[PDB]
Design an enzyme around this catalytic site. Structure first.
Site, PDB file in Angstrom:
ATOM      1  N   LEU B  28       0.824  -1.205   0.000  1.00 54.26           N
ATOM      2  CA  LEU B  28       0.000   0.000   0.000  1.00 54.26           C
ATOM      3  C   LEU B  28       0.860   1.258   0.000  1.00 54.26           C
ATOM      4  O   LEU B  28       0.609   2.184  -0.776  1.00 54.26           O
ATOM      5  CB  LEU B  28      -0.947  -0.020   1.205  1.00 54.26           C
ATOM      6  CG  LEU B  28      -2.272  -0.751   0.969  1.00 54.26           C
ATOM      7  CD1 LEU B  28      -3.213  -0.542   2.135  1.00 54.26           C
ATOM      8  CD2 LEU B  28      -2.929  -0.292  -0.327  1.00 54.26           C
ATOM      9  N   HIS B  29       1.884   1.306   0.859  1.00 58.14           N
ATOM     10  CA  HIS B  29       2.893   2.357   0.764  1.00 58.14           C
ATOM     11  C   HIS B  29       3.731   2.246  -0.500  1.00 58.14           C
ATOM     12  O   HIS B  29       4.393   3.221  -0.876  1.00 58.14           O
ATOM     13  CB  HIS B  29       3.820   2.337   1.978  1.00 58.14           C
ATOM     14  CG  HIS B  29       3.378   3.230   3.094  1.00 58.14           C
ATOM     15  ND1 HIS B  29       3.847   4.516   3.247  1.00 58.14           N
ATOM     16  CD2 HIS B  29       2.516   3.020   4.115  1.00 58.14           C
ATOM     17  CE1 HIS B  29       3.289   5.061   4.313  1.00 58.14           C
ATOM     18  NE2 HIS B  29       2.479   4.174   4.860  1.00 58.14           N
ATOM     19  N   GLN B  30       3.753   1.074  -1.136  1.00 54.08           N
ATOM     20  CA  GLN B  30       4.351   0.916  -2.456  1.00 54.08           C
ATOM     21  C   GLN B  30       3.617   1.783  -3.471  1.00 54.08           C
ATOM     22  O   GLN B  30       4.232   2.596  -4.168  1.00 54.08           O
ATOM     23  CB  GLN B  30       4.314  -0.550  -2.890  1.00 54.08           C
ATOM     24  CG  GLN B  30       4.742  -0.793  -4.327  1.00 54.08           C
ATOM     25  CD  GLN B  30       6.239  -0.965  -4.466  1.00 54.08           C
ATOM     26  OE1 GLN B  30       6.778  -2.037  -4.194  1.00 54.08           O
ATOM     27  NE2 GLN B  30       6.921   0.091  -4.893  1.00 54.08           N
TER      28      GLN B  30
END
EC number: 3.1.-.-
Lengths: 293, 187
Positions: B28-30
């Protein structure tokens, strides 16, 4: 009449320890020179092994041999139970051979299920499987782990050829050695997961790897023949078939779907179904272990 | 913020859960730094019965912009085999007061006493026991693992759901912090 006090079956389907090393993308052909990735120590204290910054691909190599001679016990107590047990494995292999099991074993070699905590974020895994006849390759294969699923049973002609090769092995009609190399793009400097010792990572001679029975549990995920309402998928084969991480324990001896009650119903008095639980009991005899009193 | 995506993690013997949630939030932070991180943050629906357990469902909560133009269509997802996620729609209209957030506390006095060492080149006895955290160590109840992103060791995100009184609602911010929401709907 009755069951022997000891009845042991040896390990067919023998895997090795998959050696893992670094590498780069799209250089999948000349794989002989890459350095093996070892384990370092940081901070009670932990052992951590990380890929280098200029190494975006992990290679894993393992050579699976298969022995054969499935229903042949090594230690018994009576010849009558041994004769009836060889009769049960005989009427299995004459009713239907090693056709449904070997497609599942070749599937679990095809999809990179043996990359345990790296396939969950693996952008591209390719697998090359080489059948070693004399000292070099006889027939080669080429699959991608993403296109092959992990819960549904696919179909291919080359996978049928690999299933026929492994079946010619387990039926006793050849010496079967398969060198499997899996190239997996992971990117720069992520966390690979070699196995953990009794936190200490495993390494043999300054070179980390995955254990043998880890990869051996990767391909034993062939048990779909159990009476649950679905949602788990294909589980691994054990008597009272259970998963240790979930804490759930199926095939419990209240419901006659285990190994032992099925054994003394089928071997002594001839009650077993057509395909499913018969495939479970033959898969447990191929896995091996100690049964009896 | 009326577009939702119920991601249900399929059970397996292949990876037992929570590590799975950290792979999700690390993917998700990717796909956070592709665009920016002001509008959408996450929730944790129908899965807060036992008061230390998050579970297996992550609801995407941008209204129709950063659902079908951030992760689904304009990205490569990743796992896609233990999830088998579906197709969005528009949310209903309850009044659950709409707040989730994150927190971090202290549970190791060595960091605090290390910065007491470099306070003003302080001597070690006051650096040890001025009023230290050696008497009691805190603990925050729901947990994820969350391996780091660049040149460092793993974070440990602790999240808490806000005031769940069914009284009223307001027009608040989308996601304060980095990638966890502010006002988010709750069914």
């Amino acid at each position: 009449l009755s069951t022997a006090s000891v009845l042991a079956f040896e390990r067919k389907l023998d895997p090795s320890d998959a050696l893992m090393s670094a590498g780069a993308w799209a250089q999948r052909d000349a794989s002989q020179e890459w350095p093996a990735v070892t384990v370092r120590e940081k901070s009670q204290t932990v052992d951590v092994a990380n890929l280098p910054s200029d190494a975006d691909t992990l290679k894993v190599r393992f050579t699976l041999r298969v022995l054969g001679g499935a229903g042949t016990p090594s230690a018994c107590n009576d010849a009558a139970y041994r004769d009836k047990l060889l009769q049960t494995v005989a009427t299995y292999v004459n009713e239907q051979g090693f056709a449904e099991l070997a497609r599942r074993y070749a599937h679990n070699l095809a999809n990179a299920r043996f990359l345990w905590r790296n396939r969950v974020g693996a952008e591209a895994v390719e697998v090359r499987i080489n059948h070693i006849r004399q000292g070099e390759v006889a027939r080669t294969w080429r699959f991608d782990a993403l296109a092959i699923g992990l819960r549904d049973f696919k179909a291919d002609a080359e996978l049928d050829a690999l299933a026929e090769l492994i079946a010619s092995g387990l039926s006793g009609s050849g010496h079967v050695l398969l060198e499997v190399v899996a190239f997996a793009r992971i990117g720069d400097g992520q966390e690979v997961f070699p196995s953990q010792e009794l936190k200490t990572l495993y390494s043999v001679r300054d070179a980390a790897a995955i254990h043998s029975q880890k990869i051996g549990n990767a391909l034993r995920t062939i048990d779909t023949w159990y009476p649950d309402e679905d949602g788990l998928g294909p589980i691994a084969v054990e008597p009272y078939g259970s998963v240790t991480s979930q804490g759930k324990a199926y095939r419990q001896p209240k419901q006659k779907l285990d190994f032992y009650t099925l054994l003394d119903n089928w071997v002594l008095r001839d009650e077993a179904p057509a395909v499913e639980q018969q495939h479970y009991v033959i898969a447990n005899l191929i896995r091996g272990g100690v049964f009896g009193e | 913020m009326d577009h939702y995506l119920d991601i249900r993690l399929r059970p397996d013997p292949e990876f037992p859960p929570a590590q799975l949630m950290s792979v999700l939030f690390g993917k998700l932070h990717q796909a956070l730094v592709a665009q920016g991180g002001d509008r959408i943050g996450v929730s944790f629906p129908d899965l807060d019965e036992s008061r230390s357990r998050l579970g297996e469902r992550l609801r995407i909560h941008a209204s129709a912009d950063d659902l079908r133009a951030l992760l689904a269509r304009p990205w490569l997802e990743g796992l896609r085999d233990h999830l088998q996620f579906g197709e969005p729609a528009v949310v209903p209209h309850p009044t659950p007061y709409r707040q989730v957030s994150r927190v971090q506390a202290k549970s190791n006095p060595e960091r605090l006493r290390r910065r007491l060492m470099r306070r003003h080149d302080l001597s070690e006895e006051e650096a040890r026991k001025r009023i230290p955290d050696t008497v009691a160590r805190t603990l925050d109840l729901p947990f994820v693992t969350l391996r780091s992103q660049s040149t460092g060791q793993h974070f440990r995100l602790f999240i808490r759901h806000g005031p769940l009184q069914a009284t009223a609602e307001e027009g608040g911010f989308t996601c304060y912090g980095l990638s966890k929401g502010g006002f988010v709907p709750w069914f």
